[model samples]
Structures are given as structure tokens and as C-alpha cells.
Target: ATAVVRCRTRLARRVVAAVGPDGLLPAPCESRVLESALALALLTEERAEADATARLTAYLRTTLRTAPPDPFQCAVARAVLGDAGTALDAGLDGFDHFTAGRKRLMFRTVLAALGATGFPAVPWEAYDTRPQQSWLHMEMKALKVLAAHGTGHPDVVRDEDWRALLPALEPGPAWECNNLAQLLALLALRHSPRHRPALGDVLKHVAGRLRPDGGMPFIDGMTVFTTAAAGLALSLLPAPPACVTPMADALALRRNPDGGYGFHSGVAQSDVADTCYVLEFLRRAAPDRHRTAVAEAEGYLLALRNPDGGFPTFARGTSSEIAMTAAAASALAHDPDRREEVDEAVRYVVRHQRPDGTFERSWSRNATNAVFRAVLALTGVAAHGEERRSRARAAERALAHLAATQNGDGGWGHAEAEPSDPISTAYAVIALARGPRARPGGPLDRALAYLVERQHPDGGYRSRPDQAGPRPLLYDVPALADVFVLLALAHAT
Candidate 1:
């Protein structure tokens, strides 16, 4: 508790430094290869703007130096320069085989079709309209038309395609466009000068989204997730800081009409994870103080359960995800009325666990992330009859994996045998604590030591931004690492 208070003060101090007047924290991610490269391709090919385009160009020239060192991105970065063409380099990257087959034709075809806007532009046809998740597919198609136009494929730039995409440009209020969708739409509109009457306005919006360093974010801020994360982590301590309520109160009002919360306030969509984050925090911190709000959140998560018995992040009836189910199960477990849901969630989680005990990655790059969440589910939700024994064994397997996988330096990484980092290490620690098994000299002591040694002077932590490889885009939120490490210490202490 004493250690947690000190850590909380350090983290909270950074919070006061980083947040807006609303007490909502901002997560800043710098430029990426794909978005920056595509944006530069559009700007330099024509308008050749002033300091902006030059800044973007320089960012590209030296991008790989500081970028995540991804081979595909490295190839794309160079290829976008029109130097080393992806036209021939398709089979080199394994991703080409999965996304598009035969001579890396998927890369070449998509490079042309999606107009090479950014990573999110998947040539839509390649994925068969993508999980049928949201209306964003229309935005991708519209961008495909623009990319087609930009790359000089007149067949696609024909008259009807523009008008076909035109109606979606004027989005209805209910199906509000997401950040990436708007970026895609903005990229598409830039190529068609006639319909670009609002091009200036669209440009202004994208420009506004740029960081001081000119990086683009994947979506609206993870405001609700960070607050709930920090708040919940802090609340775990014997003497949680005074700011937990204020943060909790700030999140209470961010709920959507559906009773769930979005990653960011004012965003139209709600998800299971952010809602679970807020609900768990409220349950721990101020369930009595905000009884009504807590009830709404609980109801919101319960509503997210699908026919498959697992939860989806975005909405109900969407595909069920493992991490979402784990988060929901933990949040719903304490409510006896929801035990049936909790029990079903354990099945969903257990079904997905690999024979070696690691679960498939969902939202994060770190394997321990799923390990952490699955442990939370298996331990938090008490299983029924034979399943209780089953889940108990499942918990032990997960803990055993964590025990065996710790790196020589006392941390965990993106996966077993990968390099150690703060976020994954922190998650491993928290999971070790959550498992029903007891331990002292195993993962707990070593990982706690790793965190203590690696923690910054500011009392926070840093790890490579570890969210987006596929589907979702990546954003760097160092605050998330701070919260996770803080939470881990609270449990391990």
C-alpha cells in the first residue's frame, strides 16, 4: 500500500501534466509509415505544400530509423518512394501469400486498388467485406475508388463510382464515421477535384488531427479506457489516491445512450472493453456512490454477450473475441445474477486456450495480455460443478506458462522467448497475482524486480506501443503502460 501510494503520486503527477482542463488524458502517437507515406504521396504529387509536406517528406526519408522496424512497413516505406517497386517484391513478405496469392499480386493489386492510402485500406475485396462489422467498409470502398483514380485506373474513376460513393460521404448521424474511416474518406476525396468542394474542410479536419510531430492517430482518444484503467489500478491499493473519484466521475458521464462507454467520449460507438473497464473501476472504487451509473455499465456489458456465449468488443451479434469475453466475464462475475453469463464466458475462454496454455492474441501484441485477461476470467468467474475443477486446472496451466516464459532479464515480451518490455512484464506480473495458485519466488519477485529497475524516474513506465498489427490501428499511449505497471505493483505488493 505504501509503495502504491508513492507510485500513484508519481503517475498522478504526470496525469496533471498531460490532461486537458476536463481532466481527460490525451494519448499522443507520432507518424506512421503507411499513413505518412500515402499522405505525402498525395501532397507531393501535386500541391507540394510548404513546411507541412517537407516535414512529412523528411519523416519518410528517415522513418525506418525510428519506426517499429517492421519488414512489410519498411518495404512499403521504400516502395512508396517509387524507387524499389512492390510490383515485383510480392512473394518476399509472407503476408502477401495470405492476403493475396500468386507473385505477391495481392500487394501489387492492393497497392493500386486501395490507392495505397494506409494500412487500413485492405482493397476490401481481399477480405470479403471484413467481418461484416460496420459501415466503415463503404469508406474503404470509397477510398478504393480514389486510390484507383490516383493511380490512373480510369475504369474505376468512371462517372458512376464517384456518385456511388457520394451518398456515403454525407453520413447519417446514427452511423457516425470513425477516425480511420474519415481518413480514408479524406484520402479518397482528395483525388476527385470536382466533388472536393468540402476538400478544404476535410483537409482542415485531418490537419487538426495531426500531432505536433504530424503523426495520425487510429481513432478517437482512448479516454474512457485510460481513465478506467488508471482509476481501477489506483483503487486496488489500501489507500487509493483522492483523484480516483474525479476520474471515475469523469468516466461516468461519458457513457453512450446504449449504457456502454466508448474508448473516447463523444464517439458514437460503444465497446465491451471500455465499458468493462469503467464498470470494474466503479465496482471497486465507488459502487455505492455511483450505483445507477454502475448498474448501467453492468447492464451494458451483459447486453454485449452474443449467441456464441462470448462477448464482442464493439456490439452484440458481432463476432465474439477472447479478450473481450475475458474482460466481460471478470466485470460480470461479482454479480450473482450474471453467474450464468460468467460460467458461459469461462467456456468461451477455455475453448480458445492453446494446448500449451497461451490464448490467441486479440487486441495486443503481447501474448501475456490474453494470458492476463484469461487468468482474470478463470479466477474471477467461479465455474459450475465439473467446470470449476476444469477452470482451476486451466488457471494453473496459464500460470505455469507465465512461470516458464519469463525472460532472462526478468520481464516478458510480445510472446514467449521474445524480448522483455514494461507492458508485457507488468501484465505477466498481474496475471501471476490473479491466478488461484500461490507463489513467492517465481514470476512475482523477478517481474516485480524487473519493473522496479526499469521504471522511469517519473514513476511511470514505457513499452513499445503494442496494439495494432491487423484490423485495429496502433496508437502510443504511455499512460496505459503506467496504469498497467501500477496495477501490477498493487497486486504484487
Candidate 2:
């Protein structure tokens, strides 16, 4: 019990600090409300002050009276409030709407949490047959709900069976923070009475993540990606040679044995996205020292290219995505031998161009990424012959599409006519500035004005949290916002 309390205390304080005086948490969604409720429950367990409970309860009441937007939100609200009416019916109806991914699995867990039973049978085979990282997370969440109800799915309930589902000693970013919090709470509920053995270890792991200020970031530092982006941003300025050399040196040490960079040190898989960003920075800053590393990175990237003439975020056989393909093409363009691959990637990107000239990928929230990365990849092609004609045509269509999509306030959004944001606006500016044959007056000028207006006094910008993966985690990395802006400004100058 003491072990559980320590983890609860750390998570409760962080959640409490983030809740506003208005009683609402930061965002008006299921995630924030669930977090707020979890914090309150922890406070209740500890017998903390009355004022905290009162404030949080008031916030919950407001959210409860209003209808929720989606199934997950509805299920969470019902679970927290202990209300069991038609609130979750909508969730059940829409369960099949999400096609068997993280979203669907989360909905299944929510159903279990609400005590909805017997209708859609648990697909025990999905868990029993093959156990991968994504399914393991879903299994854990389901177990939490089952344990909360003083019940268990026959497939996963036994101590021996649950043991098979225990996560790695150090799980990926997708399993951090909130996932751990849920597991801790579930353990406290006596879910697996036979399995109290590993509770202490799990407690210690989560307790170490609490910040002095009481809030927790989604994961440990996004060090390699952040550093590479920062170094690249600094290069866009009239930077001193000394400034970037250290950054390049720091990145060198983070190279994975697989000849690529991970999101951070100790991550098992080194991906194309991080590897490309590191290459972008090093190619600009310290070329000589990174030459060997660059060759290795190039080889890894080429190996990830799909036969469909595009790139996937992970291995070769996965479905091709626009952003990954674009970034890969841009990074691998440095190798003369890979020119064929780069051109093929360009063709793949051109084929996927949405009718309105925007690109959407599952990994990103903003169309700015689609446009920015596409423009960068397309520009790297040699500007002659049929390749030149293809690049020009595609570039013009995308530029016009961008101009049409700009918000009235001179910014861009994840899509057309949505509210504008800093990151999206920066991407728009950079794409247009570096575009082949700039229209040079209205779109670029207006976009520059928009970005200038949004700049903070601290010489930085803030974007709404960007999604790191298909997992529901959203991260607000200000450094990425700064990097995109610097790239825009450099090209504009």
C-alpha cells in the first residue's frame, strides 16, 4: 500500500498543479478530465484537503452535463461519474467505426470499464495468438478495467497469463506516463491478487518521472530529435561555428548500432525520421566528422524504401506515407547513387497529392507538414528534362493549394479553414519561400506578417501538441516550433 501511495502522490500533485482555478483542466476533453479525476481519486485516497476535491468535482459536473464528442470521452466520463445511462451507447455504436487500431482497442477497454458485457465477445485470439507492443498496451488497459469491476477475462486474468503481458524493463514512449498511471491504479485495486510481486519495481520506475514543478512530460527528453532540430534551426541563422560543433558532437554519441538515430538514447529502434533530421543538421554543421555516420544513415534509409517507390516510417513492407517519404528523399539526396530512389519517392509523393493540394498522414496533425516536406523533397530533384517539368507542375499546384488554405488571420491549420497555429504557419512560410518560382507578393508576404505577429517576447513560438505516433500522446515541443520558424526566416532572407 505504501508503494502505491508514493506513485499516487507524485501523479496527483502534477495533475493538481495543472488544473486551473476555474476547476477545469487544460483541455476540454476525455484525456484531461480522466487525468483530473484520477488526481482527485488519489487525493481522496490520501485524505488530502477538501478544497481540492470540491474544485475538481465542480469541474467534473460541468463536463458531465455537456455531451461528449466521441465514444472514448463518453466512456471515461461515465466511468468517473458512476452514471450508467445512454452515455456509453454512442460509444458502442461507433466502436466499429475505428478499424481495429489503438482507437478501437481503447474503446474496447472503455466498454469493459463501463461493465458493458456479453455482446461483442473479447477477441482473445488477438492477444493469445500474437503478442506485439501495440496489443500488449491494449491488454494492460483491458486488465485494469476488468480488475476495477472485480472480474477478469478468462484469457488474461490468471497470474501466469498476465505475467506473459508484462511490459519491457523500459517500454517505449507510447507506454509512458498515463499508461503507467493507469497500471498503478489498477494494481492498487487488487486486480491481480496473486501478483503483487513486481509492484515495487513499477512504483519506483514511475515515481522517478515526477517533475519538481509537479507536471510530467509525456516521455523522457526527446533529446536526439530535439537537439538535431535545434542545431538545424541555429544553422539557419548566421550562427557561430562553435555553437553547432558541440551539438553535432552530442548527436554523434547518440547513433544507434543500427546505423540510425532513435528519438532518444536507449530507444531500441532507430527510425528514418530521426535519422533524416540528424543528417539534415550534420550536413549543414560538421560534415567531415559525420561523413562515416552519414554513409551508414544513408544505407539504413535506402533499406527502408518500399517497392511502391516511397518510404515507410519503420520497415520496408509497411505502407508508404508522404511525410516519411519526403524526409527520406531530402536526406538521402546527398548520395549521388540514391538519386534514382529519390526520384521514385518524388513520384510517390506526387501521386498522393490531395485534390486541394494538401497532404495528410496518420502520424501528423498538420497539413503544413505535408506541404513543407513535399516541397523540400521535390526541390532536391535535378531541375532539367521531364523531371524539371514534373517538379514545376506539382510545385505550382501545391503552392496555389497552400494560398487557398491560409486562414483569414494569415496562418494555416492542420487543414483548410481551421484556426491557424504557429507551427503550421511557419511551415507555410518555409514552403513558399523555398518553392520554385515564388508568386512573391500576396501569400508569402501575408504569411510572413502572420508569423511575425505570433512570435513570443522570448523569441520562440508555441504550437498545440504534435502527435509523436498513432498513440494518443500529444507533445508540445517548443524547439520544433522554433526550428520551423528559423527555416522559414532563413529561406525568406
Candidate 3:
């Protein structure tokens, strides 16, 4: 359709623009509050050089003034900077939004990481609650609490206690490496002058990511994630072979030694969600050339399958989540050798369907993200057991959930009854159409009308960013909005 060509051209242009001298794609994301403030707070304390300190101090002030408020960053600034520095308060600072009552626990972790003292102990209840069953995100939560052991509070978090939750920093079957920049900052902050050389390297990487506006994102260079999303969109439409080929080869080379790909190239750890996006693209675009890489990646996906027969976001046994669980089954279904894995994965997804027919948001905040992805996975594969029955009801219920939540504008949002947005609408259209009962006169057509109205003359979209770049917080990625819409139209046609 005409919709494909227009966004196809737009996506090709971005692909060509970001290709490096090495002919690989490397995309950057929008500025974020927490990273900028954390980096600033550290640089201010270290004060290596007067000119550098003065320069970063100006940036820190601009970051505080212009950026949306963050609890971790604000608390760090106030505790470390005080009245002598700046006052940056935008909320009650201890409200439901900032992880609720666990706010104190999270603060204890970050403040101590930055070498600040005198905070209250993390409440046992806050530290103990599991957001996902089976210790999902527990490694990360434990890392934040455990890593601050010796800086000041001895009894609060003992050195020995950290060993029980060991491998928070170092590699184990359990650790996750999501936010590279934040991890670098944490390691550098904990060691300081004793590890001054490491700190120097970390600071340079931190400063390199600064926007002209003086803010930095929590993670730098979402090269793999952005490129894979764009590739998925382009595969649905006509793409310039030249632009697509170079990225295909580049992505092949980006694979980690273990055969899974990360958000960026060469990362040792792989996120199942990111790999699915990349694997789906490579299969759709140039399967013959990338067959070897595809085989290796399938092995990695199988390894990540938890005993519950679901897939985790990043690390194995970390916890199985629905969105990624559905996604993994879809990605693995094509492999004849992986039949049972896909079968059990399907069971895992169908079993998790809530009574309201909605699934939890893992990476993206959008309610439809989970729905559309679930539809894509469920619609494609056949499970071998009672899962076959549950799969139908679960998917039907999800479709009903999407229909019930449609806003008056023919679009959808992050939650029920919220204002309409383009990205969410595109997702609902996919679930209704690629996964639809309605034809041109029903939900599909109305949602398509909604997307058409939102598109700009340049064939791009500027909807609110729905992804939690590193989980629990969202950031902007304008290019991805255009891609989501393109996929919707392709499936609709």
C-alpha cells in the first residue's frame, strides 16, 4: 500500500544517516533526568579539575532546571548538594509514583552508592516484595541494596549478606546487564579515588553522551533495539536494498559470542525481547544469508527457558514474563527442532492471562504493547496440550480487553480510559486486524483512521514514547513511533 512506501522512505533515510564508517547502525536516544543528575552529582564531588568541575556544574544546573523531576536524582542532589548547591523539588518526593513506600529502600541503595550516609534502613517489606513471581527483577533489586554494604552503614547491609545475593555485579547465571551507563556509573562511584583510573574511563563515556541541552539518557546508544524495531517495520514494506543490506550484515556481526544479541553490539548478556526483535527481522528480511546466526540464536533462546517453560527479559531463571514469553514462542516456532519449547512457552503465556484479560507491562508502559505482542505469538503457533484451549480463550479475552478499552477518539493509551495516542492505537489495530474480527467498518477501520489523522506530512510520527528504556521509566524515541504505525498498516492491508 501507499502507506508502506512513505514510511519505508523515511525509515531508509534514518538507517542510512546512522550507519557508521564501519557501515554499521548505531542509534542514540533522548536525554534522561536520573543519569544526568547522577553523573553530575558524582562529577561535582570528585572535582578532578577546576575547569571540568565548573563546566559540569553549569550542566548540572541546566539539567535540574529543565528536566522532569526524579526521586533518586533529587534525593541524591539534596543529600549531596544541599542548600549550598541547588533546590530541585517538583513533587512530594515520597509519593506513590516513585515506587510507593519502597521509595526509602531505593533511596538507601542509590545514596549509599554515591557515598552519602545518614539515611534510614530499607524497610523489610519493601525489600521483600516480589514485583514478578519467582524472584523476577530480584537480582537487580538485591544488587542495589547489597552493593552499598561498607561505604558507611555496616549493620544495615553487611558484607556477608551480599554474598548470599552474590553475582549482582559480576557474571553468574543470574545477573542482568541492562543499563550500561548506569552500571558504569555505579561501579565507578563505589570505588572512587582508589579506582581512579577506572573512574576516569567511566566519566569520559558518561560525558560523551551529553545532549546540547545538558541532559543524558539512563542508557546510551540503543543501537540494536532501535535498528531491529526499524528493520521489523521495513520488512513489511519496500525498502532500498542498499540501505537494508548493510544493516543486515552489521547486525549479524553484532551478535555476542554466546549467540544472543544485546541492546548494543558485543554485549555478553542478551535480552530475550531484544533478540526476538532482531531474530524476527533477520528472518523476514534476509533469512538465507543469516541462517547460521539464526541457528545459534535459537539455542540461546532455549537456554533462557525457565523451568516454568517461560522466558525472562534478560537473564535465565530471573523470572518468566508474559510479553517476552509470548514473543519467544513466536520467534522459536519456526524452528522444527524447537517444537516442544514453543509448546510449553505457549502454555506459559496462556496461563498468565489475568481475569481482566490484560497482561503486565515489562518493557513498554503501553497496555496494548503486551496485547499486540501476545496476539502475534498466540496467533502463529499451535500448542500440544490443554494449552490449545487456554490459548484460544486467553487470546480472545485479550482481544475483548482491547475492544473494551478503545477511547472515543478511535485510539488507545497506556491504560484504560486515558487519552488517545498514535503508538497505542497502532498496536490495538494490529491486535484487532492481524489478530481481527472487524473489517473496514469496525475497530480496525476506526483505528486506522486514527493513525492516518496523526501522521505528519513527512510520513513520520511523534507519539509519546512508551518503552521503559531500562525498565520502570520511559524515554523518547521518535523514530520508533513511525515504525509501529508502519507495521500496523502492513498487517491491516
Best by lDDT: 1
Ranking by TM-score: 1, 3, 2
Q: Which candidate number would show the highest TM-score if scored against the true structure? A: 1
Across 81-131, the per-residue lDDT of candidate 1 in tens digits comes to 652244234324333212234224323433553334333334535423443
The segments of candidate 3 whose C-alpha lies over 4 angstroms from its true place after superposition are: 1-25, 49-104, 111-193, 197-205, 238-242, 383-389, 437-441
Tell me the number of clashing residue pairs for each predicted model.
1, 1, 1
Q: Estimate each model's TM-score.
A: 0.84, 0.75, 0.79
The TM-score between candidate 2 and the true structure equals 0.75
* Residue 32 alpha-carbon offset, candidate 1, angstroms: 2.2
| Best first by lDDT, ranked | 1, 3, 2
Clashing pairs in 3: 432-436
lDDT (tens digit, per residue) of candidate 3 on 82-147: 421122122223232323345444545555555565334444344454433222244344444444
How displaced is residue 95 in candidate 2, in Å?
Answer: 13
Question: Which digits, one per residue and each the tens of the lDDT, describe model 2 over residues 1-493?
Answer: 3321232233223333433343212221122444444444434444544565556556656655663324444455455556323544543443321223544444454445445532135554432423222334444444443543434433444454444445522333324223333433433332444444544444344334333323234345456776676566556554333456767777777687767887755555677888998898888887898888878788888878889998877667766778889899898787788888888899898888887777764556666877888888877666588878887778778888888788888888866867888778877877887654434357887777777777665555666645533333244444466556656665564
Q: In candidate 2, which residue ranges exceed 4 Å CA deviation?
A: 1-78, 81-102, 114-122, 127-152, 156-164, 168-190, 204-208, 211-216, 238-241, 436-441, 471-473
**Of 1 and 2, the candidate ranking higher by TM-score:** 1
User: How much is the lDDT of residue 48 in candidate 3?
Assistant: 38
